[PDB]
Amino acid sequence: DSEMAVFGAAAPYLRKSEKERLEAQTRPFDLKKDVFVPDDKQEFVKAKIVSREGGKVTAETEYGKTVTVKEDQVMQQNPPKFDKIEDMAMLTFLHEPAVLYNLKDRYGSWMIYTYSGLFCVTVNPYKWLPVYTPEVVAAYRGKKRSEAPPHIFSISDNAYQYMLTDRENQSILITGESGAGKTVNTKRVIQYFAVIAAIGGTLEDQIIQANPALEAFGNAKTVRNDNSSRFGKFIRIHFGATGKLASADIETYLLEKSRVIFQLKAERDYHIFYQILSNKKPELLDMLLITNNPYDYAFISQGETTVASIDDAEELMATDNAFDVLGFTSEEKNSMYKLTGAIMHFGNMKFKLKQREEQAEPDGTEEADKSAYLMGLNSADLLKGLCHPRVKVGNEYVTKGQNVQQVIYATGALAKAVYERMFNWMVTRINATLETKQPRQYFIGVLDIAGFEIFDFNSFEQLCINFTNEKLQQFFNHHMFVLEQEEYKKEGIEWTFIDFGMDLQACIDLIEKPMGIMSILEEECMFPKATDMTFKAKLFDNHLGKSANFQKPRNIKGKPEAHFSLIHYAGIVDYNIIGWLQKNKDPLNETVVGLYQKSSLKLLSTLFANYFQTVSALHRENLNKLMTNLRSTHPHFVRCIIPNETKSPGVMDNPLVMHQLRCNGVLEGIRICRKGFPNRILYGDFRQRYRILNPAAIPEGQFIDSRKGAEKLLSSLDIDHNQYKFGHTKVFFKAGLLGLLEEMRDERLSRIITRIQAQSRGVLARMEYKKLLERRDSLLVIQWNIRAFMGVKNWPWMKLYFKIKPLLKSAEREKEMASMKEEFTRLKEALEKSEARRKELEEKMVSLLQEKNDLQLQVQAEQDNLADAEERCDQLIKNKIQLEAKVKEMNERLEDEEEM
Amino acid sequence: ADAEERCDQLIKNKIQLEAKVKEMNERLEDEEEM
Ligand SMILES: Nc1ncnc2c1ncn2[C@@H]1O[C@H](COP(=O)(O)OP(=O)(O)O)[C@@H](O)[C@H]1O
């Protein structure tokens, strides 16, 4: 149409044309004959029925195959009007393939976005499509979901509208497999709010750049994606009462610290490493005094280090610019690159065993003094601390000699813990900017907390990342199917609860519970005598045959040294248990970190200042905070779908996408959006809002009950009486009635308020153009006085005029009166405003401080109970390991005595 | 809730572990008698 031109050149990638709709109507089609049939290489395919054979069907396919099909495996083609629809809820015949071919015909035309009722499903284009042009964002401004073509920008507008209407916090929950676009879609949602506030900036830019700067440290090319991030992130975007952008808050859950020193074949270390090595800037290369060739540094160099798709010279330029805009000082940016460099050098330190003491001494002293020079330690006390760490025994410290293998492992642990703390500090500095100190009333939380991933080799953070997403999809299950459906029964609607069966809470409890995998790894890593093999024994014993998601591995590809596999929501992920306990505890040589605390490098001290609380437990508590923070928000979900393994753009593999829609439970979200009631409004808020539909049903001044008035008004609309229901405090609408009431409200308002707006445009234009007339008048007296000014200074008499009048009485008295009135007016206003503010604000402050101390006492009660539980568990687990050893020897002794 | 369930499962496991050592030390004494 004429209006779609606002979408510009992106329009062919957003909406099937009207000429295509008429063309579709020209298509030979028959509701009685056009059906889908299932197949191997394509999950579903278009076909035409040729015969009906009782409880059997035969049909022939678009690509010429013929197959016998059963009724439950055959399902209607929707008529050409409905094919490729914008919103899958509007489908006439609802089934999995109509979802697939709505996707495949849209994505076949590079229309990537579709809704599945209330929310969006996105199938990934590896091509950079124009659907994200910043002038396409403006086309979503206020364009409600029933009018707009599907896009992520529609969800962002919907969240901003529900924010302003319900006066409640919102959220946008971007989800999917790895490589689907969660990081880019997050960057687009943030771009949405940034450019929306940009037409109506420091925070606006900072929220966008807060992604790539954290990416370059956070992210590494993996086998599954060239730009897969390795840390969970939760953002809150805070808006003021006037709806403008106010603040933002970046919370990050766990960096994949293990990657810093170890990469499998075909995967990189974190991008910051190679982009500093592969460098356009020699100064970065020599200030680290690192070699330009990546290969000689053992820890980063293993795996694969050059990639088909990344201009690391520019990705370094990009990370540099991201810290420039985020306002990290040059000394901070350089120090964190120095720390990355030192973690590179730290693997190059060579240690040799003494001929008789089995103690590590450095032969490769050049690498150790290079490292110490960067971290601001000394070569000798660094080497002495590493080889001879100090441990406390009573009040005095004792010195222990380290093995060459265990000093290598300790240097790895120092590299990891310096990297991970440097990342969390960088986040804390981002959260220390990103604050324009403006008063806050609403926030919209955008989440990208992991891609699901399978590599051939998965480790501690591949458990963390897959689990952390797992919880976000179970949050989808709970919000759409539990929280939404319970509300209907609570309101007393004649509604029957339907079980969608989509539940995975057993597998989150499998990880999260005090008997889960992460609970085991935290209870085990306290014992200094624990080892990965017994961790494997206890881990298998606690879950095998006790969890539906825990199963023994097959190890068909060999490698059965120590494996387990966990069926996270989107499929298999196999895990390698090797090294996990050291990774969970992350024990640092206390002399070496005490020397770090003592460093000349202000960052390294700040990182280590103020060095039971394992990495598992800290991550866990952050993610539990996440869900508690998120339940106080109104969520919209975004399902990002990967189309194909091989990065082939525009190609769309049906088995991978359909399996993703299966694991994301999107078809159920269609069912519940069509069958259920997508929108409810409080009786007071709606009666007042849309009474405009029939003011004779709700006269002003006269007493009206909101429930009884709502009953009369809706009976007066003459709409199908089955499309609404009455609750105790909320009105209930179907999606057909909601949309019809929404549009009738918009039109009734349009007829009244456009007249009112015409008057408002009248006053706005009149008053502003009057101001332009006043500023014209001031311009006129300016140019007149400038003409007077030239006329005066070229006039020879000016010598009297200029000098005498400052001396004369007018400058003595008129200026005095001007200052007197200025001071008295400012006196009056400043006095009243400051007294008002203080009197109100002191009583508010004391009320909040009292509530702060009450909750503080609550925290004190918590810390008391947790300390009791800690001492109880510590004594129970220490006595278990002692007695368990005693029973092992008792049994072996009795076996010996029976053998006698 | 985490700390209480942790203590509760440690006590239950200790109960079963006590039953284990009860049977073991009994059988060791029986072997010493025989
Ligand atoms: N809608 C899209 N448009 C353009 N490129 C995309 C889109 N979705 C994914 N990609 C590409 O796929 C890769 C992964 O995107 P990303 O947002 O990082 O997802 P993930 O974080 O799951 O890897 C990137 O190279 C990105 O450019």
Ligand SMILES: CC(C)n1c(=O)cc(N[C@@H](C)c2ccccc2)[nH]c1=O
């Ligand atoms: C309970 C929940 C699903 N819900 C609703 O059911 C309706 C909401 N808002 C109504 C008031 C609205 C309609 C149209 C534009 C803005 C707001 N919000 C909501 O959050």
Ligand SMILES: [Mg+2]
């Ligand atoms: Mg990502």
